[PDB]
Design an enzyme around this catalytic site. Structure first.
Site, short mmCIF file in Angstrom:
data_model
loop_
_atom_site.label_atom_id
_atom_site.label_comp_id
_atom_site.label_asym_id
_atom_site.label_seq_id
_atom_site.Cartn_x
_atom_site.Cartn_y
_atom_site.Cartn_z
CE1 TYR A 16 -45.50 52.42 50.82
CE2 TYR A 16 -47.68 53.40 51.20
CZ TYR A 16 -46.87 52.28 51.03
OH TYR A 16 -47.42 51.04 51.07
CG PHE A 26 -54.65 55.26 52.08
CD1 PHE A 26 -54.63 56.63 51.88
CD2 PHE A 26 -53.84 54.45 51.26
CE1 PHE A 26 -53.82 57.21 50.90
CE2 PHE A 26 -53.02 55.02 50.28
CZ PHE A 26 -53.01 56.39 50.09
CG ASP A 27 -50.38 51.26 52.75
OD1 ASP A 27 -50.10 50.52 53.73
OD2 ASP A 27 -49.90 51.09 51.60
CB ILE A 46 -50.40 55.26 41.28
CG1 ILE A 46 -49.67 55.99 42.41
CG2 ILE A 46 -51.28 54.09 41.86
CD1 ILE A 46 -50.63 56.63 43.43
CE1 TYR A 72 -53.36 51.62 43.60
CE2 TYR A 72 -53.56 53.49 45.07
CZ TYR A 72 -52.84 52.43 44.59
OH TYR A 72 -51.59 52.19 45.16
CG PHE A 89 -48.84 59.08 48.55
CD1 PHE A 89 -48.63 57.86 49.18
CD2 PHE A 89 -49.75 59.14 47.51
CE1 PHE A 89 -49.32 56.72 48.78
CE2 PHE A 89 -50.46 58.02 47.10
CZ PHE A 89 -50.25 56.78 47.73
#
Length: 100
Positions: A16, A26-27, A46, A72, A89
């Site tokens: 991802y 962010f990631d 999630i 989140y 994503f």
């Protein structure tokens, strides 16, 4: 041939990259090159992932916009994820454990 595709209960290995709305990543599993492995449809990831990743074949990419209600929430996940942030994503399903 008949490619198997993700269903509730499968174990998936997933790349991802997640981004904010501001475009900022962010990631991602890509820099370490480490797929995230989890059981689909079990509340391990999630809600936006559990409902959003069904029917993927191995090697397929999907984009999911996930308002915070399905991520989140207002709590957020510091440092990377603000409370209330919409996540974008780009996922790539690498492997579905069931096929082997």
């Amino acid at each position: 041939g008949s490619p198997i595709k993700s269903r509730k209960g499968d174990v998936l290995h997933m790349h991802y990259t997640g981004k904010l709305e501001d475009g900022t990543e962010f990631d991602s599993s890509l820099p370490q090159n480490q797929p995230f492995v989890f059981s689909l449809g079990t509340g391990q990831v999630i809600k936006g992932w559990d409902q959003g990743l069904l029917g993927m074949c191995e090697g397929e990419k999907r984009k999911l916009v996930i308002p915070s209600e399905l991520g989140y929430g207002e709590r957020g996940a510091p440092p990377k994820i603000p409370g209330g942030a919409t996540l974008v994503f780009e996922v790539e399903l690498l492997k579905i454990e069931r096929r082997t």
